[PDB]
Write an enzyme that holds these catalytic residues in place. Structure first.
Site, PDB file in Angstrom:
ATOM      1  CB  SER A   1       7.958   8.740  45.890  1.00 29.76           C
ATOM      2  OG  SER A   1       9.155   9.436  46.153  1.00 29.76           O
ATOM      3  CG  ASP A   5       1.205   2.166  28.517  1.00 27.75           C
ATOM      4  OD1 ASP A   5       1.744   2.695  29.508  1.00 27.75           O
ATOM      5  OD2 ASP A   5       0.062   2.461  28.099  1.00 27.75           O
TER       6      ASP A   5
END
EC number: 3.4.23.22
Length: 330
Positions: free
Chosen positions: A199, A35
């Site tokens: 992004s 994770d």
């Protein structure tokens, strides 16, 4: 040193991926959920409340000649999905894909919430976010990657998750045969303890690319792609019959649909998520309403590039002094 381990979806929807991890001497092999959105290595154990164990493989520290109680240390964690676990701590030898760390903090669960109990295939979590998020008190502990870092040939790990198939986590090297083209690297902020990046935009299907900054985290421990409501609405508007259902808890779409792809930007590069990756199947067995793999982050407080996004790429988690993230197509 290096390590290389295969990671395997737990079910036919890729709800999560499990990776075998060797703990203790002699080795006890547990299947852990790696994770990148948390920083605790915790396991079901001989100390876990019996009624909260349902099929998991447990770590038994008393059977390990290298286990040592970390005296006084406790841990307690709550995840974004509302699940939780807590317990005490041992140090022991931990190996992943041939890479061995001695003295690793292994957090033994005394209690786990029902969602963990119900997941018989997940024996615990191995956190790969920054150690500043580790919950051990009163002495915070380092992640497996942080402990391994100095010994690694290069201070990196990579995630190469499969779509409805196994993939690979590598430590200490970049497998240049595992991706196509070049790797585009992008800046990371560690201020919140995550692999947080920005992004450069998105496209829906064959649509034009929208240049827009989207701050989010690269999180292998989250199944879906969670993005701003504006982005998510633009995506689902291209699917006839799709709608956000308060009763179901997100966007659903007709199971008869053909889903468009979704593209996200990494610098000037582009990662394309095929439409099929966005299908999470019937909301309930036999239903003709299917659950979407792109959902709104509104009310999470953070955008999350979870497995839906990451499995479309070869992803480099660069833990150099100035950490960065790399994405390549594959």
């Amino acid at each position: 040193s290096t390590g290389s381990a295969t990671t395997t979806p737990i079910d036919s929807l890729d709800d999560a991926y499990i990776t075998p991890v060797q703990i203790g001497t002699p080795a006890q092999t547990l299947n852990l959920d790696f994770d990148t959105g948390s920083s605790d290595l915790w396991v079901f154990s001989s100390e876990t409340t019996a009624s909260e164990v349902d099929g998991q493989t447990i770590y038994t520290p008393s059977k390990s000649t290298t286990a040592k109680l970390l005296s006084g240390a406790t841990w307690s964690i709550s995840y974004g999905d509302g699940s939780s676990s807590s317990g005490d701590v041992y140090t022991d030898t931990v190996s992943v894909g041939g890479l061995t760390v001695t003295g690793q903090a292994v957090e033994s669960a005394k209690k786990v919430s029902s969602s963990f109990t119900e997941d018989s295939t997940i024996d615990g979590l191995l956190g790969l976010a920054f150690s500043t998020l580790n919950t051990v008190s009163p002495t915070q502990q380092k992640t497996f990657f942080d402990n391994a870092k100095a010994s690694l040939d290069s201070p990196v790990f990579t995630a190469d998750l499969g779509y409805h198939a196994p993939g690979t986590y590598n430590f200490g090297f970049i497998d240049t045969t595992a991706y196509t083209g070049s790797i585009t690297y992008t800046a990371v902020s560690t201020k919140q303890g995550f692999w947080e990046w920005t992004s450069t935009g998105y496209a829906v299907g064959s649509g034009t690319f929208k240049s827009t900054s989207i701050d989010g985290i690269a999180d292998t421990g989250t199944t879906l792609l969670y993005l701003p409501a504006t982005v998510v609405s633009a995506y689902w508007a291209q699917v006839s019959g799709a709608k956000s259902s308060s009763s179901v808890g997100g966007y659903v779409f007709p199971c008869s649909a053909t889903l468009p792809s979704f593209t996200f930007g990494v610098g000037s590069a582009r990662i394309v998520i095929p439409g099929d990756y966005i299908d999470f199947g019937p909301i309930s067995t036999g239903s003709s309403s299917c659950f979407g793999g792109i959902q709104s982050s509104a009310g999470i407080g953070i955008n999350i590039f979870g497995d839906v996004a990451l499995k479309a790429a070869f992803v480099v988690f660069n833990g150099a002094t100035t950490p960065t993230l790399g994405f390549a197509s594959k």
